[PDB]
Each structure stands twice: as C-alpha cells, then as structure tokens.
From Swiss-Prot:
Record-linked InterPro entries: N1-like, Ribonuclease/ribotoxin
EC number(s) recorded for this UniProt protein: 4.6.1.24
Protein name (database record): Guanyl-specific ribonuclease Sa
Gene that produces this protein: rnaSA
S-S bonds: 7-96
Keywords, comma-separated and alphabetical: Disulfide bond, Endonuclease, Hydrolase, Lyase, Nuclease, Secreted
Keyword Transport on entry: no
Gene3D superfamilies: Microbial ribonucleases
C-alpha cells in the first residue's frame, strides 16, 4: 500500500528537481532513470507492466544513486515518493 499523501514542498528539494526533469522528459543524471518499475512486491496498486517508471531523487553527498526515488504511474498527477529504497511510498501532492 501507499502510506498517505505528502505536499511536494514537504519533500527534499531534490524531489522538485526530479519532477521538473520528468516534465521536460529529461535529460536525467542517471541512465536508470525512466526504466519500468515492476512493482514486484505489490506495494503499489496492481497495474499492467510498464504503468510505473522510476527516477532517481539525488541524495546530496551520495556516491551512489542512494535510496530516494520518484515512481510515476500513468494517471494524471500519479507520482509516488520513496525515501527508503521502495520499502514505503507516499503519493506526491504537487499543489502544496
């Protein structure tokens, strides 16, 4: 399941950057950005294969991609934030 809705303004500013990159269709800093997210664990709602895609949320100072990601669903404004490497997800509210 989804844990709730969080305003964009309440997430790390890097979440804002990522969304902006997703709006412009990149380019993205990581080549992994934009791949299918399979939702293998069924945390998110069941959808066809390819409905979800994942994008890195940069972690400052991290040498790796770190643990933060944005998962978009195909629906209008459907975007989920994970800061614990897909353990949990919050829907992002871009209006606040």
């Amino acid at each position: 399941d989804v844990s709730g809705t969080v305003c964009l303004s309440a997430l790390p500013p890097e979440a804002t950057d990522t969304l902006n990159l997703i709006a412009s269709d990149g380019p993205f800093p990581y080549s992994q950005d934009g791949v299918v997210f399979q939702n293998r664990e069924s945390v998110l709602p069941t959808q066809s294969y390819g409905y979800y895609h994942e994008y890195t949320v940069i972690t400052p100072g991290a040498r790796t991609r770190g643990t933060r990601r944005i998962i978009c669903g195909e629906a209008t404004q459907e975007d989920y934030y994970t800061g614990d490497h897909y353990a949990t997800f919050s829907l992002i509210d871009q209006t606040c």
